[PDB]
Amino acid sequence: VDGNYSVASNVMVPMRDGVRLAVDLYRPDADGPVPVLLVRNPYDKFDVFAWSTQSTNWLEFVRDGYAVVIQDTRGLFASEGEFVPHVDDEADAEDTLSWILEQAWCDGNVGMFGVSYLGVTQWQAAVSGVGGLKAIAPSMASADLYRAPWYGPGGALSVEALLGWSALIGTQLITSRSDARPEDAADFVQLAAILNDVAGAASVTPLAEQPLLGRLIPWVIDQVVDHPDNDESWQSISLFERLGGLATPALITAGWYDGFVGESLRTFVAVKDNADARLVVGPWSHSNLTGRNADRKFGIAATYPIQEATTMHKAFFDRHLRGETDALAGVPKVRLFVMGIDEWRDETDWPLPDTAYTPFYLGGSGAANTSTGGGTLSTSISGTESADTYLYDPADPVPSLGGTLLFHNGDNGPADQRPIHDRDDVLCYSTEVLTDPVEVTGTVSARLFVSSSAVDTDFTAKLVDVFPDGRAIALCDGIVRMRYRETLVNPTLIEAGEIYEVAIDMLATSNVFLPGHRIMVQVSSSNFPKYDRNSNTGGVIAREQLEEMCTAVNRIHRGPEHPSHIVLPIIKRK
Amino acid sequence: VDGNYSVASNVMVPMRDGVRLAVDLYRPDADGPVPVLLVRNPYDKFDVFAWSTQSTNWLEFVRDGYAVVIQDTRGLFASEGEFVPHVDDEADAEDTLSWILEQAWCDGNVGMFGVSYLGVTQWQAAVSGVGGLKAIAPSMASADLYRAPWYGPGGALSVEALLGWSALIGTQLITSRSDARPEDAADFVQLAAILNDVAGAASVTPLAEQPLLGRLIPWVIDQVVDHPDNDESWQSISLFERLGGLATPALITAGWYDGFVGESLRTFVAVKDNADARLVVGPWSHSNLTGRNADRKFGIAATYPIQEATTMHKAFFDRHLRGETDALAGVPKVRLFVMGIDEWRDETDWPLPDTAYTPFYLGGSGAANTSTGGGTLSTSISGTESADTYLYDPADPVPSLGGTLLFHNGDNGPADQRPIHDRDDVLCYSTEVLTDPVEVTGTVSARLFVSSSAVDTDFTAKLVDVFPDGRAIALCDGIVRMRYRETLVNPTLIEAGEIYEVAIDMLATSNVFLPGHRIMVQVSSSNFPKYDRNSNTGGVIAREQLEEMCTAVNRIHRGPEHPSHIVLPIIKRK
Ligand SMILES: *C1(O)O[C@H](CS)[C@@H](CS)O1
Ligand SMILES: *C1(O)O[C@H](CS)[C@@H](CS)O1
Ligand SMILES: [Cl-]
Ligand SMILES: [Cl-]
Ligand SMILES: [Cl-]
Ligand SMILES: [Cl-]
Ligand SMILES: [Cl-]
Ligand SMILES: [Cl-]
Ligand SMILES: [Cl-]
Ligand SMILES: [Cl-]
Ligand SMILES: [Cl-]
């Protein structure tokens, strides 16, 4: 009967190596075989409520005649084997899709959907080149684990994401015990303490000393902390280079304040020429999809639109798994929540056609130190050669406030930056108050002329919308670790005192700066614990004691010969 | 097979009047009949993800061999008939339980669980005295709809809750159309605008003029706005007086910042002598169960503990529907999240045994106006007869900040009160800085000696924890509408200038005021839009234009002959 279904629990699926992963089968009451959707989950396939609110009302897929298979990843919950993040997911996904394709209830069409880790696993599945996989729908995900979520395009560790997540997995590994242990109760306590104070956990030096996390999940040190360079161990798990060879349709969701935003958007650009790719980007952080934050409310239309998302996914799967060639009629290619005007808007492509990548140059009379300095932004090159100078002290890094934080206060993306505006290592440059709106929608970067007294250091750039009432709301930001200025692969040190031109990848945003606002950029050398703190030594940063680290006199050069700027993706619609 | 189940959609269940309500059946694969759990839902039985995250992982009940029935209430989504809130729910619940009891797959034991409206409906079901109903689990609910959520023990309208909710129902009635209409698109827009600005919608005078909401849901005016008195129309739907005659076990959940908190706790006290009642109270608001707020973080243990809740519910139902007499071994009678120390704690009863209901008297040199006045709180009666005086102007009411707000900024319960501390109509009284902790856990009220130049006005009282850093965090609050000082049923006006002793029911809290903090009480005559604004005329408030309203010179009397105080439920544990 239409609308009706059954659920079978703990169906054991054998992988190539004989290890068995558990799945749940949600199968419609059907005459013959049906199209199937697979979800690969490390947070317990039974616990559907935990993730699904960030995704789709997918029981609608089942009522509409799709089968849905939810799987425990290797070594977790009801699955056999050992869990190590990422390393087994290509093969296990391949083996699982094959098994599904071989079932009596599968009609030869398979798709995938899901958020975060349930999104990363879809890219890992799509590179298997299993013919029967017809579409994927990776939400808030990445195809390059170095670039998101563990490190970044800047070559700094996303330490708060690392320790926060490891503590969560740790908690699970315990609560899911094969056989309970005496140290479980106390370990649980230590894990909660990390999660109540991720900045605290990130502050212990040497960073590589993680007695609890290293014991529960050795990968935290063995893979992540020990591999600062984007090396073979990372390229081994990266999917990105293989994406351009695929012809798999992908429905891709991202959030402007989501740790994955940069990589999510990159995946869209990589697949769009070869297959039907779609893009939806709302003003969300990884853990806050509500549209509401402490100092910024985006309106009820900003709340993750779960029902519209369900409808969109269903049309997408109807088109690619069912061959319904008109199923996506009237569905936009790209749908963005444009902040400022706080409205959803349809677009034909990402990057937007008719993006004007426009330099806004750093300038001003006197020092740009603090928000009350004389720092300016202007579309004209500055007339006079100047330099802003500050001391970066690793023992006092600039605290993280909003942006793309994941586990350390990850629920306030558009955070008011005022609490750090009186600090001497936070350089501020702003336009005059705008009398006409300025829309910035696209990828954002800065080109800075910099110098240090140290042989390595960081430089950060942050785009900020300054409201009439004084709120200085964060939009997007990035970091460059100077040893990685040229490459994430073969780092080299710098000469103290030499001026370098460096690029800062500031990810992406969509914001209209309305009349009465200002475009503002904050420049510094730290952003902790979003990123780990540079020791200013040129050493193996994660192996250094705080005491071993050095302060740095860092300098931003600006003027005719050193035209430091932010490149803004200007959109003009009249 | 154990763990396995099937789901049948849109099974139509006939009521006594021939109208049919739709249900979904989640039935385990079972030899014979099983115990059954019923959930009555006005937000679409299909949409399980919307509410369940506030409740339980109840698929675990189904995997463990319970059937679960989820029903669309009369006139919504897949059900037939006309929707009017509350009025049909006693009979429909009765008819539905009977139908379930008659099914081949029902073993004669029925239970219920659910949150909010899904909680209110359980009290409405429990008064039918259907023998087969063995237990209920009403979360964030009430058995007296006047007292929560529509009015309150003070006799003021909960206007923000009223309009916010009506707009939500309105939105549903549209999105669920039998036959789509030309005005749907525009109506949808107007509904969103109310929900983005509930304070704005609440500000239109006369309040009873609601062209959109009155048309979509006439009950908004016909029942709620038109019945300011706790009259026969309210008593008709109230369950409270019948609760003391029941012998139904009840697992009751509440939140310290939840609009229903006062009534949730009252239901526990009413059933505890006659049946196995349980209580769980976390630091949540109706729409924020995370434990995280703009200016107050309660720690990860405060996050609604959905898995522990599932386990507790399962043991509860195992005990009462399955007759497993040891199923609740080691489960506490009462479990409270004690704020301040920010820890869960078990207790044997609510109110706590060894509560010392202790007067803290208003005093001080000079006026108590603003936070920089000389207002004090002390366990000693004030020595000298004084009075604090302010003007209450309905056109400028004291704005609502946290507390038990539902739809107008209902996600910041423990709000910092500082933004209203310089106001002249906000009287502030505080203890000295504490050097030893003071625990306040229980029902809270104030006894004030008051006078007005008006023949009716409001008086509000708010309990506040003042932190070392200056944060003035709201805990609990209430209001008395003076015409209802003696009774909610037969209001009478007051004499301008006469001193009255009035009670303010300030609901309940659990907080340890730690060393370095202060106990603080804010007194005023408005709290908008949590409550509607008194017009100070003695008229039908909801029918008055702003222009028709009067200002009031209100006065709080304090001293030996007028010992105004807050009664605090002091707990002492050494
Ligand atoms: C998702 O499930 O949360 C994590 C944030 S770091 C991420 C890990 S790949 O996946
Ligand atoms: C719940 O579902 O939300 C409402 C808050 S006013 C309440 C109405 S009785 O039930
Ligand atoms: Cl089978
Ligand atoms: Cl393994
Ligand atoms: Cl805002
Ligand atoms: Cl919109
Ligand atoms: Cl354009
Ligand atoms: Cl200026
Ligand atoms: Cl110099
Ligand atoms: Cl140079
Ligand atoms: Cl049947």
Ligand SMILES: [Cl-]
């Ligand atoms: Cl009807």
Ligand SMILES: [Cl-]
């Ligand atoms: Cl706090």
Ligand SMILES: [Cl-]
């Ligand atoms: Cl605790």
Ligand SMILES: [Cl-]
């Ligand atoms: Cl006690």
Ligand SMILES: [Cl-]
């Ligand atoms: Cl004092």
Ligand SMILES: [Cl-]
């Ligand atoms: Cl006088």
Ligand SMILES: [Cl-]
């Ligand atoms: Cl008197």
